[model samples]
Target: SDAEKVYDIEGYPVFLGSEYYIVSAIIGAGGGGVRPGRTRGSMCPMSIIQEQSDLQMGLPVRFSSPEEKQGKIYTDTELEIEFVEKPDCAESSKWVIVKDSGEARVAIGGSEDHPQGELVRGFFKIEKLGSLAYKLVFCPKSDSGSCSDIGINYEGRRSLVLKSSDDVPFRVVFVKPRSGSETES
Candidate 1:
């Protein structure tokens, strides 16, 4: 004999930069654990998500993995992409968005290592395209030990948070297509 189960998972937008850093933290000792016998079910956790910035950055850092080409900014002139993870917070990181116009240059600095609280850099221009939006992505770090010797362990959690210096509003659209039919919302 077999038992039936059900579950649900929410999907969120992942920006080009290190904007969405997955994180997990221990809340309380008496926290509730998943039911042992309940095969499957679903629950949503608390999350903070920022809007898609006017200027978007990519991940991994490579030629093929190019940043967003066209948007409110970067229509013309040269641009520079840089990722410098702050040493203070190994679990946290950052990316620098800079725009250069032959006459002048502007940039926005973002970091997950901000201890005080989540802060977003003000909009700046890349090659004179005007100001662009930005955010800071956070990821937590951990360690563990073993019997024979102290074993270093690190666990990463995934959640989405959107941040911006300006009030940039946005929305998400999911499109699911199948052989028999199509679904959109």
Candidate 2:
């Protein structure tokens, strides 16, 4: 049954993988000259790890401007945003995952002063589109302090540890989710 499904992204062996496989996306009417439609989106799964590697790392879902814009790219249900440290960053960086409803938020520091620190915020919801399988709606916020800023939309896959539900607490410390997969014999 559920045990046959693969839930571990980096080979951590997740027990309830099927319940947590999801990506966030943006949905709404188009603004400006763009025809508003559902677009694809995803977050960089490696962000939290990268932030832990370096503190000054600024991780924002970067999108190309209209002048250099491209076609609308679809996003996955379980998206992630990654962070890479700048040369000036330190090892003391921090990350926090806060959850509400069915969504999660990644924050660098508690205070707003370190807006870009190792923090990220996103929204998520799960609906049963099919039997035993649920459709995931996730939208990880870009680096804007305010959630109303304009940004190019994107979609991608993300990995989460077992039991990482809306009420769970996630930190950038010793235990965290990583990208890619590892083989298990």
Candidate 3:
């Protein structure tokens, strides 16, 4: 019963604590125009997220096991997603859901991986989209536990945000990074 899970483009089980690039699974509009890539940006205090306008591949992200150990990642595992790249401030790379009266935004700055840290608004879950593709979902254990799809909205310059059913869902697949230093980030 523990075998239903998500797999990377390589068809390997997504490993905990391993780096994976979350990329679009299906081609969308603009014909090579706006695509999501992780980079430093500012909100009120600043943030780190994949902007939909960048054509470059977003920095690889590292996942954490809810059990605080390493192993294969299963669906609804309730883990943390941290950026492999460093942050602008002293906050840990773990992604959190924050808001300022607009659609809830996925921002980085939390200092812990557990669900109890006050700064840790929530934990992310990778839901299987069918076959191999996946979509990210945010469960604000701090909130009603009503998990929302981590979609995009133009209000935040197409940055990732929680969305309703009518919004464009962020479809993605995980791929392991190649061996060797990145020549250009």
Tens-digit lDDT track of model 2 for 27-106: 21111111111112423222222111132222322222112233221222222321222212323223334343243333
Off by over 4 Å in 3: 1-3, 27-45, 48-55, 111-120, 142-145, 180-185
lDDT of 1 by residue, 11-110 (tens): 3322223222211112211111110011012121111121123122112211011345432222221223332222232332223221122211111234
lDDT of 3 by residue, 80-178 (tens): 877766544435666777665455666665544223333426678887776746778887765765778876555445567777562466777787878
> TM-scores of all models?
0.18, 0.19, 0.75
Scored by CA lDDT, what does every candidate get?
Answer: 0.20, 0.26, 0.63
Clashing pairs in 1: 16-57, 17-57, 48-161, 49-161, 49-162, 50-162, 50-163, 99-126, 100-127
Task: Evaluate candidate 1 by giving its C-alpha RMSD to the native, one decimal.
Answer: 21.3
Between prediction 2 and prediction 3, the one with superior lDDT is: 3
Q: Give the Cα-based TM-score of candidate 1 against the true structure.
A: 0.18
Q: Which candidate is the best by TM-score?
A: 3
